[PDB]
User: Which sequence fits this backbone?
């Protein structure tokens, strides 16, 4: 076992509160989970900036961010790097391993509290897993996907699944024919 | 709180579990390692004999050959005893039962499995409704938490396992405009 902030309560799993400094539009801004209340939030942890592994998901979320906003959804990516490294990464061209200009916030988890709360921190290596969390408009966790490679299709799947959760939120559910409660 | 979901290396191994299941109406011992080499869809649901239809389990059972064809198995688990699971299977669907079913029902009577999986609710004494997809190497790939029975979660699960498997086989390529730095 280890400790984490992912505690089942009631009949749901509330997303743990977080706050920290993010880079938005090239500037530092304090961000918190509660800033996204009333919207779905895709919260994407990735190991580190400036590695030799392409940031496929962040680039694709950035490219498609207007599609998510169109369905009441925001996207925030997070790693244990400082906000100064996030800014430098954005300010480095993609042809040189950088992220380049990006339209989603990069949140800093420098003191590791957020990733420990989300249960994705690796104690030995000092960074997180690659993990995509979908949080609904009530702040409840709906899905976590863990990939060890950068997977571009996970952006498509995220758009599809958010829309599916929202459809379910609104329409409820129907039982199979032939089953009746006792 | 405490759970078994511990990141290790560069991923999240699915916590070991073992317990007694009902399989084709018989009690059998089952454990996570029995599924090595196969994807495992491990579905927790709160309780047998409730007034909430068991839509997922019914659909997984009807479609189980589609999962088996892609080297995937499905196990459902609640905190109920194996005796309760067998009685539930033996109760007709039109009376709130599960009826005959082609997927194992795992008992987590002492709550060890659901605590290890981080889905146990201490106050009520049962689990959340949650679907875990575990790959052929025993690594956790996805967790989905639905409070309502969602039938399409079966179709989605099939599609996601297929996608995870496609990635396993083919790997991924970088966006065209991106190149790494180097030492």
Assistant:
């Amino acid at each position: 076992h280890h400790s984490s902030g992912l505690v089942p309560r009631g009949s749901h799993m509330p997303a743990p509160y977080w706050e920290g400094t993010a880079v938005i539009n090239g500037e530092f801004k304090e961000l918190k989970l509660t800033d996204y209340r009333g919207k779905y939030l895709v919260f994407f942890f990735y190991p580190l900036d400036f590695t030799f592994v392409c940031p496929t998901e962040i680039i694709a979320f950035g490219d498609r961010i207007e599609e998510f906003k169109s369905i009441n959804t925001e996207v925030v990516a997070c790693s244990v790097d400082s906000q100064f490294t996030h800014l430098a990464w954005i300010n480095t061209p993609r042809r040189q391993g950088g992220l380049g200009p990006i339209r989603i916030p990069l949140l800093s988890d420098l003191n590791h509290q957020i990733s420990k709360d989300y249960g994705v921190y690796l104690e030995d290596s000092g960074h997180t897993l690659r993990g995509l969390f979908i949080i609904d408009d009530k702040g409840v966790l709906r899905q976590i996907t863990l990939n060890d490679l950068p997977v571009g299709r996970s952006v498509d799947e995220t758009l599809r699944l958010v829309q599916a959760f929202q459809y379910t939120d609104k329409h409820g559910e129907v039982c199979p024919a032939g089953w009746k409660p006792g």
